[PDB]
């Protein structure tokens, strides 16, 4: 893989900002907590910083690319992700090429880590934990990315996300919340080295 796992301990400010953007941006989902299960917090089990050579590599160059063709600014964002294939992802990185196979054009991201949770066992929380299949399971753990995101100069709408590229002159997706639209905010890149996978947080969910 090339991956390497940093631990970071509890006591770190590093640990700690990583844990209040994961709670502190928990909200309510329209789906009544479906997908993603029930609860008004996490608990955080570990958090671990990626490392990998080539994969920051990638994600340098096309970071300076972006940056080049908007004015000169990148406009990263730590965002969430939560998927089935965050496995691949740490050792591979993020490939656009499986946005098809996986359910979907585009990798999504989150500002609210409840949202990404939703996603976690797939696509409407699919089937849930594999041991129980359980959407809602307060044992299991769970896995998210906290990832750097390279929006670039990005187009918005009020509508759900379903193109296929970023429009002309623009490098990244988001889908606004509004009044009879969206809640909460989507975030959709087209190409892989636009994000980093920075943090692997494995957490569970809390029963109120
Ligand atoms: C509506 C919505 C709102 C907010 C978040 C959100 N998140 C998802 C997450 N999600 C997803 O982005 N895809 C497309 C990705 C394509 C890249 C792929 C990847 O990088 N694989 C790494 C790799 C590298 C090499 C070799 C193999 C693999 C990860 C999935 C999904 O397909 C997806 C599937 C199920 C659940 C969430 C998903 C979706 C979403 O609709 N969101
Ligand atoms: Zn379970």
Do not use: W
């Amino acid at each position: 893989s090339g991956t390497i796992l940093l631990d970071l301990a509890p006591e770190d400010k590093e640990y700690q900002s990583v844990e209040e953007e994961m709670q502190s941006t928990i909200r309510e989902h329209r789906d009544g907590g479906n997908a993603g299960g029930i609860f008004n917090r996490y608990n955080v089990i570990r958090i671990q910083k990626v490392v990998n050579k080539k994969l920051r590599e990638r994600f340098c160059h096309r970071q300076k690319e972006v940056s080049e063709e908007n004015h000169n600014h990148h406009n990263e964002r730590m965002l969430f992700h939560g998927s089935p294939f965050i496995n691949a992802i740490i050792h591979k990185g993020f490939d656009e090429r499986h946005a098809y196979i996986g359910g979907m054009a585009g990798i999504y991201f989150a500002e609210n880590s409840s949202k990404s949770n939703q996603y976690v066992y797939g696509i409407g929380g699919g089937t849930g934990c594999p041991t129980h299949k359980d959407r809602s399971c307060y044992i299991c753990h769970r896995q998210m990315l906290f990832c750097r995101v390279t929006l670039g100069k990005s187009f918005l709408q009020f509508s759900t996300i379903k193109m296929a590229h970023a429009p002309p002159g623009h490098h990244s997706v988001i889908g606004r919340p509004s009044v009879n639209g969206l809640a909460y905010a989507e975030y959709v890149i087209y190409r892989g080295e636009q994000a980093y996978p920075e943090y692997l947080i494995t957490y569970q969910i809390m029963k109120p």
